[PDB]
Amino acid sequence: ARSVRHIAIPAHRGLITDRNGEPLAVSTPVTTLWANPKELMTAKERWPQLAAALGQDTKLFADRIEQNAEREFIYLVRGLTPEQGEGVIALKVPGVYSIEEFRRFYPAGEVVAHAVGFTDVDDRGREGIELAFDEWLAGVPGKRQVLKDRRGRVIKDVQVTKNAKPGKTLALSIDLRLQYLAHRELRNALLENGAKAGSLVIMDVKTGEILAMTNQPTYNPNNRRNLQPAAMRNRAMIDVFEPGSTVKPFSMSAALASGRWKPSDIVDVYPGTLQIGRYTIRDVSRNSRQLDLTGILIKSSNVGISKIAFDIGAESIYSVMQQVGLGQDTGLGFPGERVGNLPNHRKWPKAETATLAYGYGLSVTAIQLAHAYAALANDGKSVPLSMTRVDRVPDGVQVISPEVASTVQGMLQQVVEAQGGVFRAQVPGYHAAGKSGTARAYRSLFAGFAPATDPRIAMVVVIDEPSVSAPVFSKVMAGALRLMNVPPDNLP
Numbered sequence: 001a002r003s004v005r006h007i008a009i010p011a012h013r014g015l016i017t018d019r020n021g022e023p024l025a026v027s028t029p030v031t032t033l034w035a036n037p038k039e040l041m042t043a044k045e046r047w048p049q050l051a052a053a054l055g056q057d058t059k060l061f062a063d064r065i066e067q068n069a070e071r072e073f074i075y076l077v078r079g080l081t082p083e084q085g086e087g088v089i090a091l092k093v094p095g096v097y098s099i100e101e102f103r104r105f106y107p108a109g110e111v112v113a114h115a116v117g118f119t120d121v122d123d124r125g126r127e128g129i130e131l132a133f134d135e136w137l138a139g140v141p142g143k144r145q146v147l148k149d150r151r152g153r154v155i156k157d158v159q160v161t162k163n164a165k166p167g168k169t170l171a172l173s174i175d176l177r178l179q180y181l182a183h184r185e186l187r188n189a190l191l192e193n194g195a196k197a198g199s200l201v202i203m204d205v206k207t208g209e210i211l212a213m214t215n216q217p218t219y220n221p222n223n224r225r226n227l228q229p230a231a232m233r234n235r236a237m238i239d240v241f242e243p244g245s246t247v248k249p250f251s252m253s254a255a256l257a258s259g260r261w262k263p264s265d266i267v268d269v270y271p272g273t274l275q276i277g278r279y280t281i282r283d284v285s286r287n288s289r290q291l292d293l294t295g296i297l298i299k300s301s302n303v304g305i306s307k308i309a310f311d312i313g314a315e316s317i318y319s320v321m322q323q324v325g326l327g328q329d330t331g332l333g334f335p336g337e338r339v340g341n342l343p344n345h346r347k348w349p350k351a352e353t354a355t356l357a358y359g360y361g362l363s364v365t366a367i368q369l370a371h372a373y374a375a376l377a378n379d380g381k382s383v384p385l386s387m388t389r390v391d392r393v394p395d396g397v398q399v400i401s402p403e404v405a406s407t408v409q410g411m412l413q414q415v416v417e418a419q420g421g422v423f424r425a426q427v428p429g430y431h432a433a434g435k436s437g438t439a440r441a442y443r444s445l446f447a448g449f450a451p452a453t454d455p456r457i458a459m460v461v462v463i464d465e466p467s468v469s470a471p472v473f474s475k476v477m478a479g480a481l482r483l484m485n486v487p488p489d490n491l492p
């Protein structure tokens, strides 16, 4: 005669904004439609009109209901515009009930899909920040006490057992303005250079905040009809790649810290090749004998960096790379994030020392490389990575000594000004610094920070299988510094 079950009360799921309160993920009211089959079986004359008004086949609908005859409840349609749901309600069919419900909407859409992520039909995070802060955002579902009837008639509620608690607002470190800039210029380059996938990260070197993270290809999380698993891949967090020549600045920092190297010291790279048993280190352009250390970067000499590494040892280079976070957990707690590989030897071989010095044998994510570069721009100080707005900045760790870090910044500044600039990479108005890298078709890498005299932004551009990165960097950096009203530092 009487039965007491418990239908839960959906919590309003917390708003996600960028730095500036711009909505990135919003709980939209919608309407589900369910029905008591036992109620529906007393109204079989009504089913064809209900099927029709649900776009479901008359005889399939009937079958669906017949074979759920003894079951108390089923879902008709989830997530109609409340009016669409209201029209179905007008039909006033016995047994057809509604529940109001929240469905997430993503106003920035594809622009920031990998960072924000998306929910599943339960309104429960299943990628990105939506999944990473699902606690914070979800809030406590309330519960209803009510009275059963012979086939599912609700009579009343005994008491409000649980008031539903809303989830909490979440403001990201992303600046949707810089995010849009990066999204756009990255996508142009992919097309302009005939390339397959991309990534671009922008970090605030002072606060640890990720200002922008974008990837190509990307998807529209509002329209997930055809899945395309490659498009949803948040590469900046997930693709480990080998970083190549963009770790030569940390090799160099190890050298300048050893006590044995200053930038005007000389290495002989004649003839542009070097052997270790069967392994042969090749430079890309081999018309050099003596180079100074700024020159080994400007001429992108693998032989020169390996010769410095042999003198100082791989252990020193490994230690600098580990202190900046290469191949180390970032603590972001983002879903399926990859740690990467930093190889360790008790006795490093000459071949293994050479490859590590020039970026091979280790694998990193773009977030790690950006973070390492941010540690270089802030003068050797690593502020912890953050994907949420940082109003009170945590203390940073000194991982490279400031004189050495300041010295490395200058060499990188000379890398952009004398050669590695004039065709691409010079950021107009500000002194920029950075290092290019080429990873096998190949993968095009560029990492750097700006402005050179009070560094603010660190940036990584990763572009795969092109038919390169330095313009993407130069353009995105230019606009990013302007969006932040960073006064130019290239002055008379």
Ligand SMILES: *C(=O)[C@@H](NC(=O)Cc1cccs1)[C@@H]1NC(C(=O)O)=C(/C=C/c2ccc([N+](=O)[O-])cc2[N+](=O)[O-])CS1
Pocket (backbone or CB within 6 Å): 244, 245, 246, 283, 284, 300, 302, 358, 359, 436, 437, 438, 439, 440, 442
């Ligand atoms: C660091 O990664 C070094 N590269 C290698 O040792 C591995 C190589 C990949 C392909 C060739 S060698 C140095 N880094 C750089 C760099 O700083 O970008 C280069 C650049 C060489 C390069 C690559 C591709 C093309 N291209 O038009 O396709 C042209 C050049 N190039 O300018 O000669 C490699 S050495």
